[PDB]
Scaffold this active site. Structure first.
Site, mmCIF file in Angstrom:
data_model
loop_
_atom_site.group_PDB
_atom_site.id
_atom_site.type_symbol
_atom_site.label_atom_id
_atom_site.label_comp_id
_atom_site.label_asym_id
_atom_site.label_seq_id
_atom_site.Cartn_x
_atom_site.Cartn_y
_atom_site.Cartn_z
ATOM 1 N N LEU B 12 36.601 34.580 57.018
ATOM 2 C CA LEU B 12 36.188 35.428 55.894
ATOM 3 C C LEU B 12 37.259 35.468 54.801
ATOM 4 C CD1 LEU B 12 34.396 38.368 57.779
ATOM 5 C CD2 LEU B 12 33.265 36.575 56.424
ATOM 6 N N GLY B 13 38.468 35.048 55.151
ATOM 7 C CA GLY B 13 39.590 34.999 54.227
ATOM 8 C C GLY B 13 40.895 35.452 54.839
ATOM 9 N N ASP B 129 46.217 54.987 48.066
ATOM 10 C CA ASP B 129 46.128 53.668 47.446
ATOM 11 C C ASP B 129 44.698 53.277 47.136
ATOM 12 O OD1 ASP B 129 47.296 51.364 46.272
ATOM 13 O OD2 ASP B 129 47.282 50.269 48.178
#
Ligand SMILES: CC(C)NC(=O)[C@H]1CCC[C@H]1Nc1nc(Nc2ccc(C(=O)N(C)C3CCN(C)CC3)cc2)ncc1C(F)(F)F
Lengths: 36, 268
Positions: B12-13, B129
């Protein structure tokens, strides 16, 4: 494809992940960088 | 659990500290994402306690708009994280593709984000974040908070760590003051603006000018924005943390009620 259909099926028919995965014993966080 | 209990479909990366794979758990034929981390690499980079904190936080959260961590296991060389598969992928890629989101899409994401953050805050977890790059999208495009890199369980709810991303920094972090859960309210306001405009509100050619715009709350709204969206952003982007619109207030905001098309996923 059978995968695209299975992904759709998973959304409409969710499983009890808390019982199927959560109930199964997990390694201690302090053990993760130690021997398997 | 062992890696042999899964059939790897495709990659998927590349994530922050490991590759992610689309996989299917053999026993239940359940599709999930598997994040593979190398024990030696993490130890050499000295991110062992950082990973432990991220796992401790994410593995105990259960919300439709927070990416689930089902379980985790390890072998001789690797640590494996069993994660919820978000079929529509990276939210930042979608924002980059469209340039900016329409009001319906933005309001839906804002309701989902405020609900997820409310769930965190009622457990004294501060995210710290929130940005498009840390969000994934579910089967029906539902927002999924999927990185907890800067997150903290803060029982006293008073911190000093300057963290997050430049364009999303609240004034209290830049000024070196103590901060609390209200940093997430500020970031939600920056996120709303970025969704609607395509650029963060204090975008500047230098870090010193960005810091200056943030601490002066030099908010300059483009003319295409509706009065409702400007009202919500203005109420979140307050210099004083106690004056920021609470998360329940975001969910109740008339612009959110009028434009959100939020759908809760089916449950077991
Ligand atoms: C920190 C932040 C949250 N990001 C991440 O963690 C990254 C790290 C690598 C991938 C991702 N992590 C995850 N990604 C998914 N789903 C996904 C991703 C990519 C696509 C996709 O390739 N396309 C849409 C398209 C397919 C077609 N090509 C041409 C363009 C992209 C489709 C689905 N589910 C769960 C996870 C998780 F988190 F569990 F690991």
């Amino acid at each position: 494809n059978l995968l695209t259909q299975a992904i759709r099926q998973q959304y409409y028919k969710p499983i009890d992940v808390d019982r199927m995965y959560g109930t199964i014993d997990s390694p201690k966080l302090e053990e993760l960088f130690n021997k398997s | 659990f062992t890696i042999d209990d899964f059939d790897i479909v495709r990659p998927l990366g590349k994530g922050k500290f490991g590759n992610v794979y689309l996989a299917r758990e053999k026993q239940n034929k359940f599709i999930m994402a598997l994040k593979v981390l190398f024990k030696s690499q993490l130890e050499k980079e000295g991110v062992e306690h950082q990973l432990r904190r991220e796992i401790e936080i994410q593995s105990h959260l259960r919300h439709p708009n927070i990416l689930r961590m089902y379980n985790y296991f390890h072998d001789r060389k690797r640590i494996y994280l069993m994660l919820e598969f978000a079929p529509r992928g990276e939210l930042y890629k979608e924002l980059q593709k469209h340039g900016r989101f329409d009001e319906q899409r933005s309001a839906t994401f804002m309701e989902e984000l405020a609900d997820a953050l409310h769930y965190c805050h009622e457990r004294k977890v501060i995210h710290r974040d929130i940005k498009p790059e840390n969000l994934l999208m579910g089967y029906k495009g539902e927002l999924k908070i999927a990185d907890f890199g800067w997150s903290v369980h803060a029982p006293s709810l008073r911190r000093r760590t300057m963290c997050g991303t430049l364009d999303y920094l609240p004034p209290e972090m830049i000024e070196g003051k103590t901060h609390d859960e209200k940093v997430d309210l500020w970031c939600a306001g920056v996120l709303c603006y970025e969704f609607l405009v395509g650029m963060p509100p204090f975008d500047s050619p230098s870090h010193t000018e960005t810091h200056r715009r943030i601490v002066n709350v030099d908010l300059k709204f483009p003319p295409f924005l509706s009065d409702g969206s400007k009202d919500l952003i203005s109420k979140l982007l307050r210099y004083h943390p106690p004056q920021r619109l609470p998360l329940k207030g975001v969910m109740e905001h008339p612009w959110v009620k009028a434009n959100s098309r939020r759908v809760l996923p089916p449950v077991y």
